[PDB]
């Protein structure tokens, strides 16, 4: 409830499910994938788009039912003169799978000759640098994109949502609901006590 009307995120979009129905819906596993990219490559992050990011880095399924959280971070981790703190792989000899972290750090072989790790002919260096500078345009500013994945299995989900609790009124024959039991009657005072677990 406080994440939608926060009035502090640059891009807050959801796919698959509605952003107002997941507040009370139960979820089994709630993942959190954070990554800083450019400002123009944000359009590639969508369930149904490709590019040099959703293919060789962080790949997302086409039927992703979640939300995409991304805000502006120009006055945070950005300096003038050239950004050399974030890297990214340009090409790779294979195609990654959705929900998989890049572990193998090899050299892209464009030709038919082995590279043996050393950079040379037909052995380009895939890890390139960005350019997060406060004097560039809009498509060159860093944006911390956080992707929240919602996956439900057969295990009992323990992460649901808070319930809006009202007040308590008696002396009337109205309807009430006290945890599961939904009765309609007049709530009067009692003298007996129950058990501290029932």
């Amino acid at each position: 409830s406080v994440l939608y009307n926060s009035a502090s995120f640059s891009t807050f979009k959801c796919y698959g499910v509605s952003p107002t129905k997941l507040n009370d819906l139960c979820f089994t596993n709630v993942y959190a994938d954070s990554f800083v990219i450019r400002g123009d490559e944000v359009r590639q992050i969508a369930p149904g788009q490709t590019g040099k990011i959703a293919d060789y880095n962080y790949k997302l399924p086409d039927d992703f039912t979640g939300c995409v959280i991304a805000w502006n971070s120009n006055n945070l981790d950005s300096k003038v003169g050239g950004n050399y703190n974030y890297l990214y792989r340009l090409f790779r000899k294979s195609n990654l799978k959705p929900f998989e972290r890049d572990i193998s750090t090899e050299i892209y072989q464009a030709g038919s000759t082995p590279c043996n790790g050393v950079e040379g002919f037909n052995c380009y260096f895939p890890l390139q640098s960005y350019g997060f500078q406060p004097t560039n345009g809009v498509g060159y500013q860093p944006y911390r994109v956080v992707v929240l994945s919602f996956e439900l299995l057969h295990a009992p989900a323990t992460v649901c949502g808070p319930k809006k609790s009202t007040n308590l009124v008696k002396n009337k024959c109205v309807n009430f609901n006290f945890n599961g039991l939904t009765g309609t009657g007049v709530l009067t005072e009692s003298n007996k006590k129950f058990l501290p677990f029932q």
């Binding site: 123009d40 050239g82 892209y108 464009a110 002919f121 380009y124 640098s129 350019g131 809009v138 498509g139």
Partner: protein
Amino acid sequence: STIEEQAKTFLDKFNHEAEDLFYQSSLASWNYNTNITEENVQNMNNAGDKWSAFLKEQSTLAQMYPLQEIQNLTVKLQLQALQQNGSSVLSEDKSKRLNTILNTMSTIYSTGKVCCLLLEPGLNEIMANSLDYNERLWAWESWRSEVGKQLRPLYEEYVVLKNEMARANHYEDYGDYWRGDYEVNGVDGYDYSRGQLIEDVEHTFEEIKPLYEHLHAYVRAKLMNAYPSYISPIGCLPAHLLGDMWGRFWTNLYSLTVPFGQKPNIDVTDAMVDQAWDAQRIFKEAEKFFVSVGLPNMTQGFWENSMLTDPGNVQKAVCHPTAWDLGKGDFRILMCTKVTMDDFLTAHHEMGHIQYDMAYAAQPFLLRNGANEGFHEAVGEIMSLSAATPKHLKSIGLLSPDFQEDNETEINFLLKQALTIVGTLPFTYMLEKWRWMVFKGEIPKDQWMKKWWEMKREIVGVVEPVPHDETYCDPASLFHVSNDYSFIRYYTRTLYQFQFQEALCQAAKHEGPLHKCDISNSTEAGQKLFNMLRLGKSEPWTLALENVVGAKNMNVRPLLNYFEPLFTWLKDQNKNSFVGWSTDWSPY
């Protein structure tokens, strides 16, 4: 594997490192322009040294990839300017000889003092405001007898060195090397060979000749009263009575040639003082102009990084009118904003140049330039010409809906632009054509000054007031020759200025002449212009020209429709003088 597949991988590796090195060389140059210090100079040389060293290494590895193995019709156009060797294509012994001449010609031209006197605006104001025969002649003869003599041995060796340098990159001569920019080497069908550039230019120049004959006869008959024993109505005009040292800018001759003195011209200087512009404005007005055309809005970093103020004489700055392109979405314009009349049209001219850079923003660094050298300047000429219309400036903020205007007012506007736009047009057609015959081998080494004065009386109409010999040299003393800059790019700028204006004014529900066209509330005329700007160099200029005008070849008809009321008035006025100019005539 695949040669074409490995070609795109080599481009992505170079583009990710070229934008970082080029930005550091441009950011250090911006700090020197804001504050002239001795520290920012070393920052640009260190950043520029890494760019020249990295470009040479990538040009050698690009020679292994065949050029014919490109099917996308895009990589072939990018590897043409990458596999070049530059001036260092010859041997190591002749490498320092060619670069030394480029420094000797630029030093004498910059230090050319007449005893004292500076260069610009030193000798420019003397040859303009003088009105005397025994004053401006001494300033013109001393420049050809001192500067031309020292540049004579350097100009002779400049032809033999540039001839072998051009042939080393598979060409013909120096003039043929400049023809490769206009040559189509990508999409088939819409090709444009280098041999076609020889023709067309020579055919369209003959149809515009009757327009120049009526203009040259009116100026000669007007200045006849000032020089009765020197300017004949049936003769010609000397080389010093043109209001310029080299006969390039003829705008200064408008003060001594007024066809109507009873109708004042437009003036937007007093209108800016009444409405009180903060001196930080002008750009705010210039912003809403391109919105009504339909070109997208400007960026956000332009209003926070580009210095749009005037510090004055208390701060060292060199706010020269030059559009900068740092890259990576950054766009800055270096210009001192003042509350005058010339700055209102100058800001609109450079705003069209930075708009072209914003079109191909998503394209790589190898596609961040115009289609040719004569096309990037034509984008800003159509913006300042449409904004200089007296009718367009009346329906906005400045000016008065009370200022009357008629057919007599448009005569003074077409004549003023005829001494700058089409005034230097015959000079460009003669200066560039004369050098093509020397660089190729059609003129002997001892007939340079002989053929020079022969082509003047047949194209422009300029005689020699002083009988020169052979050791003299005239084209060597020029800002574009000493700096090794092409001059053919200015010829296509004049022709393409009226072709793009006629296309936008036609779809905007407006017919007739083009001296009163107003580009406002015309969405169709704005979306069509963005078609060829977004492409850039990915498509040839012949295909991009058809999307706006409708033809692949340059035309001269739109250049005549703009000066239609001016050509009509000169017909019923130049009846007492001779239409044209005489060749066998000398003032001495």
